[PDB]
Amino acid sequence: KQLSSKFGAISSVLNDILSRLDPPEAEVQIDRLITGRLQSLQTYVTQQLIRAAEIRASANLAATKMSECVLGQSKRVDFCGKGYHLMSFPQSAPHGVVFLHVTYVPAQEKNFTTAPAICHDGKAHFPREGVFVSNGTHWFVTQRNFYEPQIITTDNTFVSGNCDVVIGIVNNTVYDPLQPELDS
Amino acid sequence: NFTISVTTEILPVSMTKTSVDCTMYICGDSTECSNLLLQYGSFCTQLKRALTGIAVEQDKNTQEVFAQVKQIYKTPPIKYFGGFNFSQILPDPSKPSKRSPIEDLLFNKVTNGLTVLPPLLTDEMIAQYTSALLAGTITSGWTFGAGPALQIPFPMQMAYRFNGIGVTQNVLYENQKLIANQFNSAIGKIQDSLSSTPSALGKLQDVVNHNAQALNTLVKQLSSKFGAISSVLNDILSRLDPPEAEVQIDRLITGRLQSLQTYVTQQLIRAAEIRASANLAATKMSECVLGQSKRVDFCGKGYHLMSFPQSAPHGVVFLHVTYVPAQEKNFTTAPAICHDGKAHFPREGVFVSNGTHWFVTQRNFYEPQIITTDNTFVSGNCDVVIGIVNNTVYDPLQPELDS
Amino acid sequence: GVNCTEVNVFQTRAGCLIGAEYVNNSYECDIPIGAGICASYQSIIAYTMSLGAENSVAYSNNSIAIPT
Ligand SMILES: *[C@@H]1O[C@H](CO)[C@@H](O[C@@H]2O[C@H](CO)[C@@H](O)[C@H](O)[C@H]2NC(C)=O)[C@H](O)[C@H]1NC(C)=O
Ligand SMILES: *[C@@H]1O[C@H](CO)[C@@H](O[C@@H]2O[C@H](CO)[C@@H](O)[C@H](O)[C@H]2NC(C)=O)[C@H](O)[C@H]1NC(C)=O
Ligand SMILES: *[C@@H]1O[C@H](CO)[C@@H](O[C@@H]2O[C@H](CO)[C@@H](O)[C@H](O)[C@H]2NC(C)=O)[C@H](O)[C@H]1NC(C)=O
Ligand SMILES: *[C@@H]1O[C@H](CO)[C@@H](O[C@@H]2O[C@H](CO)[C@@H](O)[C@H](O)[C@H]2NC(C)=O)[C@H](O)[C@H]1NC(C)=O
Ligand SMILES: *[C@@H]1O[C@H](CO)[C@@H](O[C@@H]2O[C@H](CO)[C@@H](O)[C@H](O)[C@H]2NC(C)=O)[C@H](O)[C@H]1NC(C)=O
Ligand SMILES: *[C@@H]1O[C@H](CO)[C@@H](O)[C@H](O)[C@H]1NC(C)=O
Ligand SMILES: *[C@@H]1O[C@H](CO)[C@@H](O)[C@H](O)[C@H]1NC(C)=O
Ligand SMILES: *[C@@H]1O[C@H](CO)[C@@H](O)[C@H](O)[C@H]1NC(C)=O
Ligand SMILES: *[C@@H]1O[C@H](CO)[C@@H](O)[C@H](O)[C@H]1NC(C)=O
Ligand SMILES: *[C@@H]1O[C@H](CO)[C@@H](O)[C@H](O)[C@H]1NC(C)=O
Ligand SMILES: *[C@@H]1O[C@H](CO)[C@@H](O)[C@H](O)[C@H]1NC(C)=O
């Protein structure tokens, strides 16, 4: 569209404007038109350059996400999709990509009671990778998600000092493995 | 021994939106501009489209950097957080603007042909965003952005973070009051540093001064003669002949189009830089606030536990809580230990000894324990390693099953 | 930008809106305006930025929830 602009000249044409004007003013008119069109081309290439820089940054981010979310698994939060990330399925697209993220969305939580530690036999008990979760008079342990009760034993817990400094501690009875098999 | 310190990392988010139309900028209410500017084509229409696109993408970026949750969380009416005092962080309803004193001090410290477009999200909504995010990260633990919210007590989520960084959680319980006192002292010290030192907030002041200097240079540069007969727009409209006024004002609007073009290019490059900085800030938001990061030297100087999101004028301010070890002591190490001709390797840590007594320990803390069988594994013999030492390994229950 | 003593009429921070009636209700933003003002058609109305819904989970000394 900017090719057909007059740019302050008599006409936007090139061959017709040479015959109608004498060279001492046709040279000035042509020089003005050429400078205007070169300024328009400079604006176009500046816009193309900043757009190419933005697309290059986006493509670097897409290549990083190619290197991380698709190749293997990353444990970071809401970078590859929303929430926890399991895999990524890159699919073809003309001048772009489209993403399919298999995500982990926990739901349907239930209220429960906990404890910081267990004060049994004069010593404190701490979970290895779980947490003490209870609902009533009984006590159990479970993981971070998909609540599954388990009997507190000595292999999933460890000991560190006594139980006197932990605030909010509650007494509990812990079942020890190999206790029924002692005399046999 | 370990200490808890807090630092600041300030990244710009959004500048001031600008709107420029070509005709009113080049001249004031002249039909000659109307019949001459269209001879240059739609050059100024492209600039107006570019500025509107920059404003739209800036509003979208401002929406994206903060609004990363599907719900607004209000603070509980009980301030007990297991002995932890968070007073100047949570917003106080004794202020009409509902701001914490730290961002109040930050806002007090931080200082015609143009139009100043107000931002899409006002400062009240930004403060509400920061308050809701702080509530969500203080009462729902580090796992709330994946869907529906949960609730975890503050010592338990701190123990989860200490487990995730690579140390045992028991050292949190042995010095809980000491950790809370050190956290309160660090918060007070960084509040005093922000209220005293004026050079810690240089990035936001620099970008606002850059935008204001660009606007002021444009304003002062508009009123120049540019080699024409007259500088005032309507003076040459009544002093010069209207047939003879097709050269001076043409050169004037050509030079003004050049100045507007180079201002547009400078604003576009500055907007690209601010967009990159805000993408980095959004990465920080997604990595260090929504959950705990494991890569080193990304949030704070040292091992990162969790971070505090807060509101800043034309930007964001960060409170990164790190883990700085101290009290270095020399000790002797060994590659493995051999008992009864079989080599024993540590389960997760390393062997440590002061004299002639060997003990096991965790990764980055000293807690001596008796070398047992359950915390080690046997692979091969003690004849392939180099520089092994000799010590006995106790056996659990071995004197308990004799009955 | 301009004030609206000169020239149904509701005063806002980014100017004023002519031809619409302000409401005190809360809805989801459809047309972004500025300074927290949003407009939606259902004639045309204007309303402030309503940030979804408020849901504060209860907090106590001992309370834990695990999804199943
Ligand atoms: C807490 O949860 C446990 C686990 O389900 C409950 O124990 C069950 O109780 C029912 C009711 O008698 C029994 O039929 C099941 O066999 C029990 N299961 C196990 C694994 O013990 C317990 O009742 C719950 N407590 C409360 C107060 O709700
Ligand atoms: C680890 O460092 C902290 C910080 O200095 C020590 O806490 C100080 O302990 C002394 C004496 O025990 C007190 O007089 C100070 O008031 C404490 N500081 C604070 C801020 O409360 C702590 O004792 C050190 N622990 C070890 C094992 O050296
Ligand atoms: C948490 O810390 C703040 C600040 O250290 C405490 O606020 C102080 O409270 C006392 C008692 O009224 C005042 O004399 C001070 O002027 C307050 N300092 C301020 C406002 O900076 C607050 O009491 C602490 N809360 C708890 C529960 O310990
Ligand atoms: C290295 O530290 C350990 C841990 O305190 C010391 O072991 C103690 O030694 C005394 C004297 O034999 C015993 O009464 C204690 O029961 C030991 N404690 C433990 C936990 O084993 C050991 O003596 C220290 N070594 C040197 C050279 O000082
Ligand atoms: C650790 O124990 C092993 C086995 O008892 C030692 O190996 C033997 O050491 C004796 C004398 O120390 C030598 O006569 C044998 O020839 C060694 N046998 C082998 C297969 O090497 C070993 O020397 C001990 N190391 C230390 C530092 O006490
Ligand atoms: C747990 O109890 C709180 C307090 O009454 C309640 O608001 C919440 O909805 C409960 N959670 C569930 C899953 O019912
Ligand atoms: C039970 O707990 C209380 C306080 O938690 C403690 O004083 C008491 O000694 C405990 N009793 C037993 C048998 O553990
Ligand atoms: C450890 O040994 C080195 C080497 O002699 C010494 O420079 C350093 O001070 C020692 N550190 C401690 C804590 O003894
Ligand atoms: C507009 O004018 C009214 C009355 O003349 C005044 O109350 C109001 O503050 C003015 N608003 C602005 C933005 O100037
Ligand atoms: C409704 O909004 C108007 C602002 O136009 C305000 O003056 C009035 O007090 C509001 N009424 C209620 C009940 O909130
Ligand atoms: C937690 O326990 C303390 C005393 O240890 C008590 O003052 C406080 O009210 C309790 N908080 C609750 C029940 O929410």
Swiss-Prot record, chain A:
Changing residue 18 to F: In strain: Omicron/BA.1. It comes from the Viruses. This is Spike protein S2'. The lineage of its organism: Viruses, Riboviria, Orthornavirae, Pisuviricota, Pisoniviricetes. Changing residue 108 to H: In strain: Kappa/B.1.617.1. Subunit of the fusion protein that is processed upon entry into the host cell. Mediates fusion of the virion and cellular membranes by functioning as a class I viral fusion protein. Contains a viral fusion peptide that is unmasked after S2 cleavage. This cleavage can occur at the cell membrane by host TMPRSS2 or during endocytosis by host CSTL. In either case, this triggers an extensive and irreversible conformational change that leads to fusion of the viral envelope with the cellular cytoplasmic membrane, releasing viral genomic RNA into the host cell cytoplasm. Residues 1-30 form a coiled coil. It comes from Severe acute respiratory syndrome coronavirus 2. Glycans are attached at residues 111, 135, 171. Disulfide bonds join 69-80, 119-163. The chain holds residues 964 to 1147 of 1273 of the full protein.
From Swiss-Prot, chain B:
Changing residue 206 to N: In strain: Delta/B.1.617.2, Mu/B.1.621. Changing residue 357 to Y: In strain: Theta/P.3. The record marks 99-100 as: Cleavage. It comes from the Viruses. Glycans are attached at residues 1, 85, 330, 354, 390. Disulfide bonds join 22-44, 27-33, 288-299, 338-382. Changing residue 374 to H: In strain: Alpha/B.1.1.7. Changing residue 115 to N: In strain: Lambda/C.37. Residues 205-249 form a coiled coil. Residues 176-226 are annotated as: Heptad repeat 1. Changing residue 112 to K: In strain: Omicron/BA.1. Precursor of the fusion protein processed in the biosynthesis of the S protein and the formation of virus particle. Mediates fusion of the virion and cellular membranes by functioning as a class I viral fusion protein. Contains two viral fusion peptides that are unmasked after cleavage. The S2/S2' cleavage occurs during virus entry at the cell membrane by host TMPRSS2 or during endocytosis by host CSTL. This is Spike protein S2. It comes from Severe acute respiratory syndrome coronavirus 2. The chain holds residues 717 to 1147 of 1273 of the full protein.
